[PDB]
Design a protein around this nucleic acid. Structure first.
Lengths: 161, 65, 55, 68, 116, 95, 65
RNA sequence: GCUUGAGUCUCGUAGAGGGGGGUAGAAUUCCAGGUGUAGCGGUGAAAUGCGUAGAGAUCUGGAGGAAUACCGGUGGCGAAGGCGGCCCCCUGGACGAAGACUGACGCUCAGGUGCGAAAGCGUGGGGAGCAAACAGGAUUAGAUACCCUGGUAGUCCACGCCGUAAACGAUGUCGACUUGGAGGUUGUGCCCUUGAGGCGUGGCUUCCGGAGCUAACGCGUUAAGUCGACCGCCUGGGGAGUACGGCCGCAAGGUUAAAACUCAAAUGAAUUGACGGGGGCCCGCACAAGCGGUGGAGCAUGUGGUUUAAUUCGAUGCAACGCG
């Protein structure tokens, strides 16, 4: 908004594992205001991600996540008649949430029988650098890196951190 | 500022390039009278002296010759 | 409903930067207090260079 | 002095500017969000780890402690 | 290929494009690269980044002439003109001197009337 | 672009609907892609007035014209609408 | 323009003198003969000069800060 | 008769004042040659266009035309129009110091005569760049336009014509008088030039303001203040600076200049709002970041239409349409 760096509230961590990133991930596919069955989908998917990956579950999810987190993201701008996209760097809070949104959408596609099987296979190919969300990641990097020639005025991401 | 031609009793000759090179810049351009602070009469005599010395090639027009 | 963003200090910066880029070579639309006028002019002179680098 | 979602910005010692990154802060990497883990306005352990002579970036850290 | 030592790097830096012609001391060309031919097209030609990629894609393909040091001439009041010489400090060259060959007429011919 | 006609105290005859529709179609073709148009005809004991609301991509735009015989009011409203459309059209060209 | 010197050099001096006199005269001469409005633009420029000088001078009274 | 008005002479002073001649440098274009190769150019985006027949770039040489960066100064000169590289020749005016001289020789001026930007016209040259007309590409609903790519008259010179301009300070000329300030430019006098110093004195000029004036805006010793001499011009708006006739012009057209008719207004300045594809600042689920919808389907309910014997009446942009 115009005003208000807003008084921000935190979230509850995940019960089964010591993670708030995982609780955010439950809140992403928590469709229709119903947390419990989304928790059953996430747990049911990390179990078969462990059996279909061998390694542990939290590192399985995080290694599967860092192959779809982005670095540069386009912002569409128009000046005059043109309307070109300008690469802004993603801030590392937006980064992993923007990854998990693509994982969850690419799991709502892809359709297998169950949602835990779809999301389990989608995280598996996210470890394999093979699935859909890595194609969307590489689309974002190809068009921001393709439109890389714009670093300008003041409407985006002041001096540094 | 001070006008050095007013500090002398001069009437600017075009041949003392030791003095005229204090009034060309290093690109050959004549320096304004708000910078050097000369009087306007000696500024006109100065400009005619610079252009005349350029004609006799005692001063350059530009630096790209 | 919460409180003002970057309390005119580096908002005074980007007002002087936008006003610097979009012409306005007045440097005569600033604030009047010192801590905001200083970087309205700071953004103005940081915007003159960003006008030289582009059209 | 001000934690900007990727760090904490300790700025003691006579104008030395921007410092500790979110990557160290503990022995966990990404999930930490420094506002949850340290403070606002508090004097801490932080050691230097890099001074870059050009571009005026010292980069302190906080993981250099005793947990592992 | 000629095994030249030093070169003169002309940079034509107009509004809509920058072209970079690396020549020798003599004044005859060795290799050139433009801000249009580096993949950037139309309005995107008119950026400093396309001038930087142009100076890269000239500074190699003049490798076979073996230039250690070069002068830099720059003609044109364009959006390149400084990123393209940062891209020649960074390209592995020794810059002897930098000049300005922007043609300033002691007003002669009449310019066009262009805008409304 | 579908034109909806309604009338408060004005009995919309079939010859009245043919003319209004033709005029609206002609205006729509001339200035911009228009999605829907509502026409309201009011009679208040003297003033034959007309309202129109055009829903166009940019948004709503409205005009109103009082006349003497209903037909005159409709003509005024249509010219006003055309003028408004020119403003909206290159208001969202603005290259 | 012309910069040659020892190992810390090559950028600041050059973009200074280059940028000022270059961008001035080329951005001026690039089009528009005008024949008429250097007269108007110098008249407005210098009327704005005396109005800015007298305006700041009589604006040097107070501002209630 | 007299010297104060006017004019002449002796010294200088500054100045894009005018006419003629000559010459210099940068740049643009073209031509010839070299190196080199895949683009150039252009725009808000594009295409028309140019380029593998070697373009664009870079270097060397040559040709030709035009304008004179910096100095450049709300600076200078000229009656006005206007006049900017540098040098020569011929020539006009202004200014000041000290004297001498003539002795009212003065001011204005209808008719007349002269000068008079740009465009244009005639004759002969010249033609770089730009550029009406014109072609093409776009844009647009259309686009005989703005934008782009080209491009002929013209822009230039010599000799004639035209005689108009927002030819404007929208302020006729000449003269006198009437508080100040800050500057510019150009002379000159005195004194410690002893230091870019101080005190006066003339001319031209820029701004701000005093009384006074003005409908106000504003003008304000360079008046739009107080007066005097002479001239030009005005008498509601449209018709109309048009028609007819005269005079001038090669023509375009210029000048002089009506009337019928028609309306009760037209106008100037200032005010309060409203408005702007004017500006500045702040804010809003206004945009951006997201979540879920409507529009497709069936059904419910309301409305328009159509029907009917009646389909009771009202609510209709937002702010009527599961509304009374």
């Amino acid at each position: 908004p115009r005003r208000r760096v807003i008084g921000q509230r935190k979230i509850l961590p995940d019960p089964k594992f010591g993670s708030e990133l995982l609780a955010k991930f439950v809140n992403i596919l928590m469709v229709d205001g119903k947390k419990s069955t989304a928790e059953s989908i996430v747990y049911s998917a990390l179990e078969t991600l462990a059996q279909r990956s061998g390694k542990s579950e939290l590192e399985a999810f995080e290694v599967a996540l860092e192959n779809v987190r982005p670095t540069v993201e386009v912002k569409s701008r128009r000046v005059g008649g043109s309307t070109y996209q300008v690469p802004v760097e993603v801030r590392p809070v937006r980064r992993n949430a923007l990854a998990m949104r693509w994982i969850v959408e690419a799991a709502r596609k892809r359709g297998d029988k169950s949602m835990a099987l779809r999301l389990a296979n989608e995280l598996s190919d996210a470890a394999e650098n093979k699935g859909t969300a890595v194609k969307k990641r590489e689309d974002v990097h190809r068009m921001a890196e393709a439109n890389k020639a714009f670093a300008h005025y003041a409407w985006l991401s002041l001096r540094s951190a | 500022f001070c006008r050095f031609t007013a500090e002398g009793v001069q009437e600017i000759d075009y041949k003392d390039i030791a003095t005229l090179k204090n009034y060309i810049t290093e690109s050959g351009k004549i320096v304004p009278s708000r910078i050097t602070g000369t009087r306007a009469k000696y500024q006109r005599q100065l400009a005619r002296a610079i252009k005349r010395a350029r004609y006799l090639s005692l001063l350059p027009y530009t630096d790209r010759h | 409903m919460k409180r003002q963003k970057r309390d005119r200090l580096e908002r005074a910066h980007q007002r002087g930067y936008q006003a610097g880029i979009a012409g306005r070579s007045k440097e005569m639309c600033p604030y009047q207090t010192l801590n905001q006028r200083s970087q309205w002019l700071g953004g103005w002179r940081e915007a003159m260079a960003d006008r030289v680098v582009m059209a | 002095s001000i934690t900007d979602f990727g760090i904490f910005i300790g700025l003691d010692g006579g104008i030395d500017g921007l410092v500790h990154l979110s990557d160290i802060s503990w022995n966990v990497a990404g999930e930490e969000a420094v506002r949850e883990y340290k403070k606002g306005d508090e004097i801490a352990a932080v050691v230097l780890q890099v001074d870059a002579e050009r571009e005026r970036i010292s980069l302190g850290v906080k993981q250099l402690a005793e947990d592992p | 290929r000629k095994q030249v030592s030093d070169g003169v790097a002309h940079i034509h830096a107009s509004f809509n494009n920058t072209i970079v012609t690396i020549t020798d001391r003599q004044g005859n060309a060795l290799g050139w690269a433009t801000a249009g031919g580096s993949g950037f097209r139309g309005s995107r030609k008119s950026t400093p980044f396309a001038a930087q990629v142009a100076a890269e894609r000239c500074a190699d393909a003049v490798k076979e002439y073996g230039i250690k040091n070069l002068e830099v001439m720059v003609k044109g009041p364009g959006p390149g003109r400084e990123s393209t010489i940062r891209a020649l400090n960074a390209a592995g060259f020794r810059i002897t001197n930098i000049t300005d060959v922007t043609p300033i007429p002691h007003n002669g011919c009449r310019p066009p009337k262009k805008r409304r | 672009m579908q034109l909806n006609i309604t009338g408060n105290n004005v009995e919309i005859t079939e010859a009245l609907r043919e003319f209004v529709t033709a005029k609206f179609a002609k205006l729509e073709q001339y200035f911009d892609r228009i999605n829907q148009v509502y026409v309201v005809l009011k009679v208040e004991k003297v003033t034959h007035t007309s309202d129109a609301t055009l829903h166009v991509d940019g948004g709503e735009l409205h005009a109103s014209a009082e006349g003497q015989d209903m037909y005159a009011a409709i003509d005024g409203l249509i010219d006003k609408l055309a003028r408004q459309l020119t403003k909206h059209k290159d208001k969202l060209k603005q290259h | 323009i012309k910069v040659r010197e020892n190992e810390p050099f090559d950028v600041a001096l050059r973009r200074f003198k280059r940028s000022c006199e270059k961008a001035g005269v080329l951005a001026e001469v690039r089009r528009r003969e005008f024949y008429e409005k250097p007269t108007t633009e110098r008249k407005r420029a210098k009327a704005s000069a005396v109005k800015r000088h007298a305006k700041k001078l009589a604006r040097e009274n107070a501002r209630r800060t």
